[PDB]
Amino acid sequence: AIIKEFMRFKVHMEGSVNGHEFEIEGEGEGRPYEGTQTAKLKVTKGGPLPFAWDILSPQFSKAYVKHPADIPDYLKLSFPEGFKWERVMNFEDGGVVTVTQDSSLQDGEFIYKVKLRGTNFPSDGPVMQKKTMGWEASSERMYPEDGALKGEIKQRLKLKDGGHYDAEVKTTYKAKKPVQLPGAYNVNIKLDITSHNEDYTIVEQYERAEGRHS
Amino acid sequence: AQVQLVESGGGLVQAGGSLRLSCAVSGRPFSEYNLGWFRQAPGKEREFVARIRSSGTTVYTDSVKGRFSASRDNAKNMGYLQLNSLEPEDTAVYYCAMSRVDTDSPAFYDYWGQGTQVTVSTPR
């Protein structure tokens, strides 16, 4: 057995945002064929963080996307070896987040390792001032290119004052060994922060994700 | 609530491995029904795999004989399909269905599950 209908994961992230270094450790679980999962994350170094948790939340699992039977589930098929991904988020005010990630399978659990660098967030912007309140539901346009699977998202953060704050996100996903790529399709995603302590050093998340034909 | 058949037990496994599919039935006196299993791979038509009659006798399509085994537990309102010695060609969505008609034809089945994905890979 490689992927069961219920799977746990462990995640470690090391990051820096506007020069502030930190580490996070977490554990999650979900139902990969149903497209649902949760995670509990803890800031283990560099806490409390001086910036919005919301820029980190999408970095903590695309093996848990429900796919129609006729769309190859490339990231599931990459196991047991797994896959890597690289992401750039370009925020409307010039902040940039670059992310690299490795996903593997060890003793029946997924293992995630994340490296993140954020730069150029304005000091009075909503990220450094912690003025965000969660992502709106996203649709990621997926397409094969250069032997990899790529995704593009127009992502939108809610602001506490009622406004919104946008980012353009591009990700490249690459299986460690060659497996069958899909055609172009969409992945619908909704990510929720379901609980947090006062300074966001312990945070719980829930995500639902489902692939659909364009 | 409405009659429901719910498959579980699928996933991704390497060739030669095994999975145990199950079908949980609600809303009917399960012991009266025959339970059929069908599968559909991408680009192909859905095909009969196996069935267990209300009487307990079983029928298998030729390509799965000696590898797959259908059983039932009436007290649990459950049917089972044990998949042993899996091959890449067994990759498909597997469906359970029930009827009081004894047949391999999907046309006479009254209720269908939503399906469970079974993917059999080759090692590399």
Residue numbers in the entry:
A (entry chain A): 6 to 65, 138 to 291
B (entry chain B): 2 to 125
Sentences copied from the publication:
In contrast, LaM8 binds in a completely different area. LaM8′s binding affinity to mCherry is mainly contributed by CDR1, CDR3, and one residue in the constant region. At the same time, CDR2 has a minimal direct contribution to the interface. Two hydrogen bonds are formed between Ala145, Glu144 of mCherry, and Asp111, Tyr112 in CDR3 of LaM8, respectively. Arg164 and Glu144 of mCherry bind to Tyr34 in CDR1 of LaM8 through hydrogen bonds, while Gly170 of mCherry binds to Arg29 in CDR1 of LaM8 in a similar way. Furthermore, salt bridges are formed between Glu144 of mCherry and Arg29 of LaM8, Arg164 of mCherry, and Glu33 of LaM8, respectively. Gln3 of LaM8 also binds to mCherry at Lys168 through a hydrogen bond. Additionally, the residue recognized by LaM8 and R169 in mCherry is replaced by A164 in DsRed. The binding epitopes of LaM8 are different from others, while the epitope of LaM3 is similar to LaM2 and LaM6. The ITC results demonstrated that the binding of LaM1 or LaM3 to mCherry did not interfere with the binding of LaM8. Specifically, LaM8 could bind to the complex of mCherry-LaM1 and the complex of mCherry-LaM3, as shown in Figure 4H,I. Interestingly, the binding of LaM1 even increased the binding affinity of LaM8 to mCherry (from KD 199 nM to 54 nM), while the binding of LaM3 only showed a slight effect (from KD 199 nM to 236 nM).
